[PDB]
Amino acid sequence: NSSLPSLRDVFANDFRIGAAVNPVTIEMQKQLLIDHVNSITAENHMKFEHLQPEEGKFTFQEADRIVDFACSHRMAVRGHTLVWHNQTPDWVFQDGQGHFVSRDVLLERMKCHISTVVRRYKGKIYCWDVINEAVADEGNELLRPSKWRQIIGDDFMEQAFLYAYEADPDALLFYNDYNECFPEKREKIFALVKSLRDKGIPIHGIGMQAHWSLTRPSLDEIRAAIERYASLGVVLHITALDVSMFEFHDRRTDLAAPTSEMIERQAERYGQIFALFKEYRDVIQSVTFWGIADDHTWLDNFPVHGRKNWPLLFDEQHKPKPAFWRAVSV
C-alpha cells in the first residue's frame, strides 16, 4: 500500500469517501480505514435498539467509540439512523398494558429520542439519516407499513425532521432509502421529498443506499435518479454502496470464491459507477461503502444466510481488488 493511491485523496475534489463500521471492524480493518476514508458511519450502533434499548436507558458506549475513532483521525461522521421500521424496540410503540400508544405519546417518545441522541453528537456528526426506508418497496402505495406511520399518521416524517432540525439546526438531514434507482420507487421517493420540501420541512438531502448488483440498476437508471433527485435542490450522498456478486434471483450458496468473470465484471461496474459519480461531483458530496473489505459484509448473510459475498474494493486480506484500480483511475 505504500505506493497505493488513497481513496479519499483521489476523490478529494469530488466527494468524501466513507465506510460503515462497528467497534470490532474498526480494530480489524483499522489501517485500511486510516489510509483511505474521511467519513465514518455506524453500521448498527446508532440505530434505535442500540441507543435506547429500554425507555430512559441510553447505551451510547459503542457509538461513542466509533465517534472517538473518527474524530481522532479527522474523519467526518454520518448519523444512521433515527426513525426506521426496523431495529426499533417494541417498548417504543406500547403502553403499560402492552397496547399501542397514542399519536401524541409516540411523538413525545420520538422527540425525546431524537433530541437526546442528536444533541449528544452535535458538533461531531454533520448529517443524520432522519427517516430511513419509509417508501414502499413493492405495491402501488406510496408508503411502507410501519408502527410509526400507523400510530402517528403519514405526517410522522414531517415531525421527525422538525425535531431533528430543532436538536441541531446545523446538521444536514437526510431521507435515506434503497432500490432508489428503479423508476417506480424513484418517483415515489421524489414525490415524497418534493412534498416535504414544498411544505418547508427541513430535509436537506437524499441518501441513496446503493446496495447494487453487477447488473442492477443500469447506468442510465443511476444517471436518471441522480438528476431527478438533484432537481429538488437537495444534496446527495451515496450511503451504503456495495456491488453484490449475486443478482436478487441468484440464491446460490456453493460458491467458495467469485469467478474471474465476476471479478472482472465487478471491476468494470465499479469503474463505470465512479465515472458517473465523478461526472455529478457538483451534487454528490459523499460516497460511503457499507464496509470496506470483503472480510466483513452484511451481504454474507443477506439475503441468503450463511454464504459468502465479495462486494467491496478490498479483498479479505485487505489487498486492492481489480475494482479498486478501475475505481481510482476514473
Residues that bind Na ion in the complex, under the rule CB under 5 A:
15, 281, 285
H helices then E strands: how many in the chain? 12, 9
Minimum distance from residue 240 beta carbon to Na ion (Å)? 18
**Which residue minimizes CB distance to Na ion?**
281
**Which set of grid coordinates corresponds to residue 227?**
438528476
Minimum distance from residue 29 beta carbon to Na ion (Å)? 25
If the CB atoms of residues 281 and 319 are measured against Na ion, the closer one turns out to be 281
If the CB atoms of residues 12 and 257 are measured against Na ion, the closer one turns out to be 12
CA–chain centroid gap for 136, Å, is 17
If the CB atoms of residues 199 and 281 are measured against Na ion, the closer one turns out to be 281
If the CB atoms of residues 14 and 177 are measured against Na ion, the closer one turns out to be 14
Write down the residue that cell numbers 424513484 correspond to. 186
Minimum distance from residue 228 beta carbon to Na ion (Å)? 18
Minimum distance from residue 281 beta carbon to Na ion (Å)? 4
Cα–Cα distances in Å, from 74 out to 34, 36, 42, 153? 10, 12, 16, 40
If the CB atoms of residues 15 and 270 are measured against Na ion, the closer one turns out to be 15
Minimum distance from residue 178 beta carbon to Na ion (Å)? 22
- 273: nearest Cα among 211, 321, 231: 211
Asked if residues 80 and 239 have their Cβ atoms less than 8 Å apart, the reply is yes
**Three-state secondary structure readout of 258-298:** CCHHHHHHHHHHHHHHHHHHHHCCCCEEEEEECCCECCCCH
